[PDB]
Structure 1
Amino acid sequence: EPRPNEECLQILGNAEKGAKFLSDAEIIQLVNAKHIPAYKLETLIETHERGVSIRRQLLSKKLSEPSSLQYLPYRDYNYSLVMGACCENVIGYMPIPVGVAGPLCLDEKEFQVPMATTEGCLVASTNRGCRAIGLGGGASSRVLADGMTRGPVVRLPRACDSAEVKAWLETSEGFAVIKEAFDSTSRFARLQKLHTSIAGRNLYIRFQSRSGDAMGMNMISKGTEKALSKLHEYFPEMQILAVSGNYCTDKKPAAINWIEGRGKSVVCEAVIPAKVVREVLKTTTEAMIEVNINKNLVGSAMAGSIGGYNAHAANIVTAIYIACGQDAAQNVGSSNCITLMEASGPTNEDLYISCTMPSIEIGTVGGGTNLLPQQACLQMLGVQGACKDNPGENARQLARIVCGTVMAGELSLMAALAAGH
């Protein structure tokens, strides 16, 4: 019954028929005969999963092994929340095993932390650290700063002019004018002190603001564009070269994030009694400190590290981020961490530990946190979506949990390194 191209095409152009009245083979025949662009399937096909299905069938016949997608799942997933929002040219989804570490005893609460990973022993090891913390009387944490950033680059005709623009942005009245434009774009937009850097006739401007419970890239970028249109009214010779001049800095290693912070800056701490260090972690405080000093400080220093003074913060950050619908590529900077270990108590046998993470780039609204499975892991922690009565409290609480879980991970791994084998 597969009809000729010309007949299939009239059915397609017929608005009370459409693709729903053609078979997969007929649509594919139309695509291979160059009557439909391979990507405009998503508009023509009236169901999301069939769109995916036909794209897979088309993709398959181009591969060296036609059956390579057999075990890539696609059926019965909620593509409604993904198409035109989270992903394109969708051919399925990738299941990432989710484990749980906890309870994490943090700020007199208890958290069951979801961790999506394929690295064996990471969840178990993280769970052991949680245990040491819990029996040690818990951890305490504080958010020290909060504000996503965007660092556009603009160019003036001369460096004397860029200098003029910088000095102008630093006057109370010049800043206030830029602040008004930025803050007008959203209810959470609240431009903080500006940070600028001249390189010749370039000027890098680092816009920073809270963003409620959203991670904030989009909002900040909208506030930035409006802020710059306003600056351009005062300086019409200014050229806006790029809305991002890598001065943010987003998803690249950069000392500015380490020193100034980006997103949430957090510190977490705990004192593990000697007894717990022995029974849970199978070592002594002395051996843990000797390793922390010579690995996480001296080792990282010999390797030429900026911000990597920790054992495996990235493991925890990455696992939580994938689980909780974060942007996993932001683990580059969000993993920044210095882990400190000191002797405590009357005989120096208790272990004071802290982790400091100045650039946790996190959110509980928007992006991947819109998807229901990701929301389940957020609900687990009690941080899903916006916080009505105290905006930001859910993103802040998630950042504290990330730092606290990183600390658990540091305890366990460092203990294992200290003992051996």
Structure 2
Amino acid sequence: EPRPNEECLQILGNAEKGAKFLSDAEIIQLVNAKHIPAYKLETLIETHERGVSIRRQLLSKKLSEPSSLQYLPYRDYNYSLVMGACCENVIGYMPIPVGVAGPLCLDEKEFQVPMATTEGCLVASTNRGCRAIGLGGGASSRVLADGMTRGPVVRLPRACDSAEVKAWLETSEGFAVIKEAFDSTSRFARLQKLHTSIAGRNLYIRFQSRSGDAMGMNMISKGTEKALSKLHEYFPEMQILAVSGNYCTDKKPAAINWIEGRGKSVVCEAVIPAKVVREVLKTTTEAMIEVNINKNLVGSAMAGSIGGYNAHAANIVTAIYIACGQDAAQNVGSSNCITLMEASGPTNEDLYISCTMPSIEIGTVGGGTNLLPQQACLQMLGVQGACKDNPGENARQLARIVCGTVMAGELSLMAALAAGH
């Protein structure tokens, strides 16, 4: 029943037959005889799941243990939203357990916050943090700035010519020409003041702009390319070396994100009465302030940290990001946080706590937020997709929730560290 290569190939090349009329073993036989390249499987095979099934079968013969994929699931998942948009060479999916911490009492609302993690006690501990906030009267937050960035590097023939371009970009008329080119690429593109920096004949230019409820990499990058195209008409000796010169800065540690901000800059706060610190967090305000000063400020300082003046902000950021279809690699910068703890009240027994996070890189449209399970976690918070009547509000709201959940996480871990055990 398994036919020779030549007969299998004419069926493959027959337009009203194709791969649907071949068996798995026949397509695999063609791949092993070098008649079909492995990468062509995607467009040849009719069903997305069958493409995955055959890729898995081919992969399995190459492994030192043939059954290693047995427990990697792949069936009955919606590959229609993933192929050609979210992932390639797909062999299945990786399930991450999702837990819920809440209610998180933030800006007079209540949020049930999804958290995808495999770290024991993180969800329960964050949920204790939420309790302390809820019985403490709730938290308030503000978005202080908003704008994704891209920081390309361009080269001029001399440092004198890069100084020329820099000064041209700071004149109102030169900026306006660049701004019109940038803003024409999308309805959300609103270029803010340009920040630039010279290193000899290099010039690093930092384009910042809102992006609606999208995280905005693709949008800002498309606007950046058009903006540099206009700049090249005025300076034709300029060389566009890279559309990212690491001055954005994206997915690496950098002081510029900390100081200037990137994406949403957020601040969150709360006052925890002495009673609640006692009953929920099992400690005193005094013990918490001592740990916070000497761990999160002084410890982080001795360690030579830029932007890591916090206990485990990245835990909460990472968990929410995975659950809500964010780019989890952007937790590098998005976890930037400084946690402050102060005595409040007449006897200094209440705890003022705040978290400031200047660089939360987040969105509710595009990327992994296109997928339906990820959309379910976004719907939990009432932030899924674009907001028609107030663009950016959904991404802004999700960013506030991230900072407030980070604060809940900070409360709980700092109490456990102050306690002992």
* Deviation per residue, 1:46-92 (Å, 9 max, x gap): 10000000000000000000000000000000000000000000000
Deviation at 1:407, TM superposition (A): 0.1
* Deviation per residue, 1:249-305 (Å, 9 max, x gap): 000000000000000000000000000000000000000000000000000000000
Q: Match for residue 195 of structure 2?
A: 195
- Structure 1 distance, partners of 2:400, 2:345, is 26
Deviation at 1:192, TM superposition (A): 0.1
Q: Match for residue 406 of structure 1?
A: 406
- Structure 2 distance, partners of 1:91, 1:392, is 35
Q: Match for residue 33 of structure 1?
A: 33
SS in 1 for 2:36: coil
SS in 2 for 1:40: helix
Q: Match for residue 337 of structure 1?
A: 337
- Structure 2 distance, partners of 1:382, 1:26, is 49
* Deviation per residue, 1:378-414 (Å, 9 max, x gap): 0000000000000000000000000000000000000
SS in 2 for 1:351: strand
Q: Could you tell me the percent identity over the aligned residues? A: 100
SS in 2 for 1:250: coil
- Structure 1 distance, partners of 2:242, 2:161, is 18
* Deviation per residue, 1:176-232 (Å, 9 max, x gap): 000000000000000000000000000000000000000000000000000000000
- Structure 1 distance, partners of 2:47, 2:356, is 48
* Deviation per residue, 1:104-135 (Å, 9 max, x gap): 00000000000000000000000000000000
* Deviation per residue, 1:114-169 (Å, 9 max, x gap): 00000000000000000000000000000000000000000000000000000000
Deviation at 1:362, TM superposition (A): 0.1
- Structure 1 distance, partners of 2:420, 2:167, is 57
Q: Match for residue 91 of structure 2?
A: 91
TM-score, length-scaled by structure 1: 1.00
- Structure 1 distance, partners of 2:194, 2:131, is 43
Deviation at 1:358, TM superposition (A): 0.1
- Structure 2 distance, partners of 1:404, 1:193, is 29
SS in 2 for 1:112: strand
- Structure 2 distance, partners of 1:346, 1:322, is 42
Task: Say yes or no: does 1:73 pair with 2:57.
Answer: no
Deviation at 1:18, TM superposition (A): 0.1
SS in 1 for 2:353: strand
SS in 1 for 2:38: coil
Q: Match for residue 346 of structure 2?
A: 346
Runs of 4 or more, structure 1, over 3 Å off, are none
Deviation at 1:324, TM superposition (A): 0.1
* Deviation per residue, 1:309-334 (Å, 9 max, x gap): 00000000000000000000000000
SS in 2 for 1:251: coil
- Note the residue ranges of structure 2 that are not aligned, 5 or more in a row: none
Deviation at 1:29, TM superposition (A): 0.1
TM-score, length-scaled by structure 2: 1.00
* Deviation per residue, 1:12-51 (Å, 9 max, x gap): 0000000000000000000000000011100000100000
- Structure 1 distance, partners of 2:38, 2:81, is 22
| RMSD (Å), alpha carbons | 0.2
Deviation at 1:99, TM superposition (A): 0.1
- Structure 2 distance, partners of 1:196, 1:115, is 38
- Structure 2 distance, partners of 1:36, 1:351, is 66
Deviation at 1:369, TM superposition (A): 0.1
SS in 1 for 2:73: coil
- Structure 2 distance, partners of 1:107, 1:40, is 52
Q: Match for residue 304 of structure 1?
A: 304
SS in 2 for 1:215: coil
- Structure 2 distance, partners of 1:16, 1:37, is 21
- Structure 1 distance, partners of 2:287, 2:401, is 27
- Note the residue ranges of structure 1 that are not aligned, 5 or more in a row: none
Q: Match for residue 261 of structure 1?
A: 261
Aligned counterparts, 1:330-409, within 5 A = 330-409=330-409
- Structure 2 distance, partners of 1:199, 1:66, is 53
- Structure 1 distance, partners of 2:357, 2:420, is 27
SS in 1 for 2:418: helix
- Structure 2 distance, partners of 1:330, 1:356, is 17
- Structure 2 distance, partners of 1:162, 1:326, is 37
- Structure 2 distance, partners of 1:72, 1:381, is 30
